[PDB]
């Protein structure tokens, strides 16, 4: 029953289409505000 549940999770990542800029924009926003905690 494990392999069954284990394939179901793989068809999910297989049927995934990565959105590279909703990522790269969320990366560049989080990076921007980390970089701001430099007051002194």
């Amino acid at each position: 029953t494990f392999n069954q549940v284990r394939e179901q999770v793989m068809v999910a990542v297989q049927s995934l289409n990565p959105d590279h800029d909703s990522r790269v924009e969320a990366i560049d926003k989080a990076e921007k505000m980390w970089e701001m905690e430099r007051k002194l």
Binding site: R6, V9, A12, V13, N17, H20, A26, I27
Partner: protein, 357 residues
């Protein structure tokens, strides 16, 4: 209840929430501890004179299970600002991680932190999942170690896994070594963090090395000047690409080990001949050491040379590939099909740390 995902790197710990497209907290995997209590991350490196620092993770493997316990403590309570008692956590392990470490990993999570449920996932595998795949070989090069991990239908092929003891530290160290003789003394731990910054902003890889070396020896079109805290601005010429060249030529720093383009080739050639084409056509790159501009097309050139001349060779290298391993974890945990793959605490008390395999 939303989950937590924490990638434990040799150099930097990346952690956030399942569902987010980016990690929330990023800090060095460092624990400092005076003989009087004990500080984590950028706190610790701010005071190198009072403290003595120790990286609890060496080459992707956890070696210090007390300092690690406080890194995870610092992650939850300080950086993420969240009670781990009410959220499942997905941790990441290096490829070829001993079963001993895994059992310690779960033991600490449930007894020290009382996490309701958990799962460990191989770092390279999550990288592949991030690019929406279950088959393909992953070049995971980070701060401490570089791996070539062939993956097929979820599982990695351990016997085919190649590894190279060369990463961001070696590169930052060689950048110091080459800048030192052009005239410029970079030798102390303070001067290193700006050399590291030199590396991350002005370094690229060449497509043709000898050709680029000839271009620099004639003109300065590849010139780059820097600026040390202290107002000087500099010129770095061929150092820009001779630094990441060691990734393809370990010979530069006295290693007889093979370059990352050959270790990729070798790693595929040991896999089942069934799969080799799918590996060639799904070469995903992950980690922060892979963030040099032009490294995909250099890898593209070097693999097409080694591989069968007719073979399809595609090289995936997303712009977010620095946090690629984390995003894979963020994805996997949020997938509604995965919640039965969680290892609940109700089971750990019933079976023990041995349960996580």
């Amino acid at each position: 209840t939303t989950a937590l995902v924490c990638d434990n790197g040799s150099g930097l710990v990346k952690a956030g929430f399942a569902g987010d497209d980016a990690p929330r907290a990023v800090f060095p995997s460092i624990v400092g501890r005076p003989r009087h209590d004990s500080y984590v991350g950028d706190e610790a490196q701010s005071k190198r004179g009072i403290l003595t620092l120790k990286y609890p993770i060496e080459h992707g493997i956890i070696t210090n299970w007390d300092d690690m316990e406080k890194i995870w403590h610092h992650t939850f309570y300080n950086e993420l600002r969240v009670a781990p008692e009410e959220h499942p956590t997905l941790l990441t392990e290096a490829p070829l991680n001993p079963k001993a470490n895994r059992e310690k990993m779960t033991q600490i999570m449930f007894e020290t932190f009382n996490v309701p449920a958990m799962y460990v996932a191989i770092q390279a595998v999550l990288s592949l999942y991030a690019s929406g795949r279950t088959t393909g070989i992953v070049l995971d090069s980070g701060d401490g170690v570089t791996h070539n991990v062939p993956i097929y239908e979820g599982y990695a092929l351990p016997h085919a896994i190649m590894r190279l003891d060369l990463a961001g530290r070696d590169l930052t160290d060689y950048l110091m070594k080459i800048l030192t003789e052009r005239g410029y003394s970079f030798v102390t731990t303070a001067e290193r963090e700006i050399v590291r910054d030199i590396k991350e902003k002005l370094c690229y890889v060449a497509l043709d090395f000898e050709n680029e070396m000839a271009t620099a020896a004639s003109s300065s079109s590849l010139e780059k000047s820097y600026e040390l805290p202290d107002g000087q601005v500099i010129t770095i010429g061929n150092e820009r690409f001779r630094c990441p060249e060691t990734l393809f030529q370990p010979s530069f720093i006295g290693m007889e080990s093979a370059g990352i383009h050959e270790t990729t080739y070798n790693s595929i050639m040991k896999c089942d001949i069934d799969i080799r084409k799918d590996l060639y056509a799904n070469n995903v790159m992950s980690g922060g050491t892979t963030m040099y501009p032009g490294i995909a097309d250099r890898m593209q050139k070097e693999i097409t040379a080694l591989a069968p001349s007719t073979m399809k060779i595609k090289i995936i290298a997303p712009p977010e590939r620095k946090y690629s391993v984390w995003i894979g974890g963020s994805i996997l945990a949020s997938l509604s099909t995965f919640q039965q793959m969680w290892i609940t605490k109700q089971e750990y008390d019933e079976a023990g740390p041995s349960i996580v395999h």
